[PDB]
Ligand binder design. Structure first.
Ligand SMILES: [Mg+2]
Lengths: 93, 93
């Protein structure tokens, strides 16, 4: 077990109920990969100003968890193939 | 004037006095580009677990500012050419 901060950028076009569902589904996926969810946060709709990129808008979701290192890559791919997930950044604290 | 969150990843090999200097120099650069620095934070040494990348380690620096949109790209390039700066992500709140 190790601690990680899971950063998620979701489709900016989601309505609140869709945002909630995705946030809940993603939290379940975390646990499904052995994660102990310590913190969770929706940081709002944000726009990437730099670097220059397509689809700069997105909802920023953030989770702090303790989970096995061996399941980190798997959880990441699981989250990435989700259609509403545009970006997944997992940082080891 | 608009509000932005300036994300900075610095060389992980910096000693504390180097970290401090860079953090101060970067804050000055911000102001030099018309930024009003509202918040500043050093979030520690972190390791990018996903996606897979070279030089995964780095100090995470974060600033919240209000500055002119027209100087955002310039400030970003200014910060990026700095040798200790490995990554610059500017998000519009
Ligand atoms: Mg915070």
């Amino acid at each position: 077990m190790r601690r990680y901060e899971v950063n998620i950028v979701l489709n900016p076009n989601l309505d609140q109920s869709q945002l909630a569902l995705e946030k809940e589904i993603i939290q379940r996926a975390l646990e499904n990969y052995g994660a102990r969810v310590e913190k969770v946060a929706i940081l709002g709709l944000m726009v990437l100003a730099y670097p220059i990129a397509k689809d700069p808008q997105g909802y920023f979701l953030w989770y702090q968890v303790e989970m096995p290192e061996d399941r980190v890559n798997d959880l990441a791919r699981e989250l990435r193939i989700r259609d509403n997930v545009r970006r997944v950044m997992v940082v080891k604290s």
